[PDB]
């Protein structure tokens, strides 16, 4: 019955997250991020809006979907890569 939409969302914030995530996986030799990982952020953000019975995805649900993909990608690497990506991507995780 409830179908949330992606109206009024920060399109410039999602482009900056994938730009910094793909630039760090090449210099460190981690898992390459294709276009399939970008669509996974919108799927998690849409699931968070369904838990609140809302028809629109606000900025609070977008910040929570990015932290899920970040925590699932940083912990899926080596020990030296986990201690390096946690300091550069700490701005997007620590929300205001």
């Amino acid at each position: 019955k409830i179908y949330p939409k992606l109206h009024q969302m920060d399109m410039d914030k999602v482009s900056r997250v994938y730009a910094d995530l793909r630039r760090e996986s090449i210099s460190t030799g981690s898992f390459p991020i294709t276009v399939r990982h970008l669509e996974s952020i919108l799927r998690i953000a849409e699931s968070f809006a369904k838990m609140r019975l809302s028809e629109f995805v606000s900025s609070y649900d977008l910040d929570r979907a990015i932290k899920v993909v970040v925590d699932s990608f940083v912990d899926a690497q080596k020990v030296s890569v986990r201690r390096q990506l946690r300091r550069s991507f700490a701005i997007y995780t620590l929300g205001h």
Partner: protein, 150 residues
């Protein structure tokens, strides 16, 4: 304000249209655009680097008109305030003082001040009589003295 926005998806024709409003040739306009392509990441606000680079090259190219008419410097500042949707005059001065430090040691910035070495020969040689970046330049104090008289 446009300077408070973080992570802005800037295109390739945006810096070209902004440089044409300040009367800049195609030689100095391509150097500003090329500086943004190599520095796409490792930045906070893309508008702070573009505004700081355009206004820095304006005083070098139009150096012959600022000495004759002191109103040119006061007019080139209010123009950038309307484009950035800002009202504070301290944000414009704080933006041109941060980008200048990062471009003070390049190759394209040296040829711009020569066509439009005396200071770089004392930093590498370890001279104690080098120009310290603490006091205000002599050419900048003469402009502010004439701005308060009009």
């Amino acid at each position: 304000s446009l300077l408070v926005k973080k992570y802005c998806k800037m295109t390739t024709e945006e810096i070209i249209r902004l440089c044409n409003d300040f009367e800049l040739p195609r030689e100095v306009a391509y150097k500003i655009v090329d500086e943004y392509n190599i520095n796409a990441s490792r930045l906070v606000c893309p508008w702070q680097l573009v505004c700081g680079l355009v206004l820095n090259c304006t005083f070098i190219v139009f150096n012959e008109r600022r000495r004759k008419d002191p109103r040119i410097d006061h007019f080139i500042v209010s123009k950038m305030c309307s484009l950035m949707l800002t009202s504070k005059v301290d944000d414009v001065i704080e933006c041109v003082k941060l980008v200048k430090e990062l471009i003070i040691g390049e190759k394209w910035f040296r040829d711009l001040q020569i066509r439009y070495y005396d200071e770089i020969i004392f930093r590498k040689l370890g001279s104690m009589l080098q120009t310290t970046n603490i006091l205000v330049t002599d050419d900048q104090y003469n402009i502010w003295k004439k701005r308060i008289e009009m």
